[PDB]
Amino acid sequence: RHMVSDKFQVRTTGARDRVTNQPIGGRNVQGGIRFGEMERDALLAHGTSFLLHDRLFNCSDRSVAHV
Amino acid sequence: DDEEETYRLWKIRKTIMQLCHDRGYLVTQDELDQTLEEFKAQSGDKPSEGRPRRTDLTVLVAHNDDPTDQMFVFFPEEPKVGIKTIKVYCQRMQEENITRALIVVQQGMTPSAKQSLVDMAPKYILEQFLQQELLINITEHELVPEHVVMTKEEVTELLARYKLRENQLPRIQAGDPVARYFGIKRGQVVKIIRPSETAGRYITYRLVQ
């Protein structure tokens, strides 16, 4: 049997969260990826800022604000 | 027990010769390499030789700078040295006009004596030295490096080269035995020639703080 439900997950664009404007998960509305504590520690560790500026900044929650 | 007492006396004499030379004051080579049994010729038994001050080598002169300064070495006999002897040699030093003296006890020193040191300090810098501290060197040891004291010109050449502040050098308070072994105070830099095994023989500047 499926020891776990071996279904997959994928998303490029679509409906995101309302209050946070972040891609939701679930796999049933085409969810996305999660970057926990260890992934962010690896990102601190590799020595890269442009990767963060590209993924977390440009892709996750980009919003043209005004001050 | 007199045997062991002159044994320790001679140990102290040898290592104070070595501290003198390492301190950079003229000592002849015969002196450093002197047999305990040969030192037995210059002085003898525990009471026969007068233990307290038949051996005060108060006289070895600073010479590279100018043959005028000549630091002082002392050997009291009261295990908790009172301030009275301190005033005694306050007198002896003002009378002869030397500003560098070294003391030795055999149990420690009364706190009030150590305080009475502090106020006379500005010229009267009299280094305290328990007999235990000078039992055997801290420099003759594998892991311990070899230090040299730089002058301010060479520290200046450094600070010019790297373009840095004085708040970026590694730092050390004077209480560390090696620091006192020389007599560095503060705001001075001693490079370190500590060996290595990766490649070997680093050079690193350490700021006394």
Partner: protein
């Protein structure tokens, strides 16, 4: 073949009374503090490294002797011997990497009570502000 004996316990001042039937020059403690005050800090290092090495060595692992001689000259560079779980790392210019360490509130409180203008070099600071940081790629631009 330098014959050895096996002692236990730290009172250095006492060992000297026996002065002529041992080698008081090649003498290091298991403690990192008994020799600290008797010899120095450059005293401490070689023994710190001996110990880390052997604790990995009873298994078989052994890191290259460059990591060790790095981690020495940061966990002890102000004379005294500090730890790094919290004490040494407290000395971090950026309180936000500490905010990332254990509890954001404590080190936010540090930043508010101190009021330092962070020079924006540490990874935490210039990563959270949104610029490119000195880390790896990002020391330079066009």
């Amino acid at each position: 073949k330098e014959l050895v004996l096996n002692t236990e316990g730290i009172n250095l001042p006492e060992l000297f009374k026996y002065a002529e039937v041992l080698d008081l020059r090649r003498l290091y403690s298991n403690d990192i503090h008994a020799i600290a005050n008797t010899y120095g800090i450059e005293a401490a290092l070689r023994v710190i490294e001996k110990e880390i090495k052997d604790v990995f060595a009873v298994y078989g692992i052994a890191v290259d002797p460059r990591h060790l001689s790095l981690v020495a000259d940061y966990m002890c560079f102000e004379g005294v011997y500090k730890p790094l779980n919290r004490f040494g790392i407290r000395s971090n210019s950026s309180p936000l990497q500490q905010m990332t360490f254990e509890t954001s509130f404590q080190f936010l409180k540090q930043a508010t009570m101190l009021g330092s203008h962070d020079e924006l070099r540490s990874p935490s600071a210039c990563l959270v502000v949104g610029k490119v940081v000195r880390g790896g790629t990002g020391l330079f631009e066009l």
